[PDB]
Amino acid sequence: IKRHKWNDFAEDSLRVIQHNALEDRSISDKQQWDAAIYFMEEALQARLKD
Amino acid sequence: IKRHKWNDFAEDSLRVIQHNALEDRSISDKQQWDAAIYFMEEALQARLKD
Amino acid sequence: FYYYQRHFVDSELECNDVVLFWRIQRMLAITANTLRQQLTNTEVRRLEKNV
């Protein structure tokens, strides 16, 4: 574990990867919209319970 | 049109993007498997007709 | 969703939060798959070398 060293170039590559992924603003799938609603409900319920 | 010039960095960025996309080898969706079968059938039929 | 399908911007039902959360969920799915591939391939060789 002490000698473990993750790739340094992975961080730079992933930064662009998720940047382009999050840049989209169109939901073409009806089920994706429903899934986002369910995901929001679970997150909201956890915060509400706290 | 003559003065048009596409971004030079897009080619390098996209090369990695599709490389990682094609590196996956797991189909977790049943409908994706069916869609690939239909896509293969259409491509095969076009080549068969020729 | 049906209202959003027609780009009803004038409609007051501007579900901006739902779109933003959907972007986060989609980003998480891509990130999980990308990390899984990197773990399965990139770091296995380094683990073997250190061992």
Swiss-Prot record, chains A, B:
Superkingdom field: Eukaryota
Result after altering I27A: In interface mutant 4b; strongly decreased ability to mediate mitochondrial fusion
Location(s) in or outside the cell: Mitochondrion intermembrane space
Summary of the function given for this chain in its UniProt record: Constitutes the soluble short form (S-OPA1) generated by cleavage by OMA1, which plays a central role in mitochondrial inner membrane fusion and cristae morphology. The transmembrane long form (L-OPA1) and the S-OPA1 form higher-order helical assemblies that coordinate the fusion of mitochondrial inner membranes. Inner membrane-anchored L-OPA1 molecules initiate membrane remodeling by recruiting soluble S-OPA1 to rapidly polymerize into a flexible cylindrical scaffold encaging the mitochondrial inner membrane.
Protein's name according to its UniProt entry: Dynamin-like GTPase OPA1, short form
Residues of the full protein shown: 709 to 758 of 960
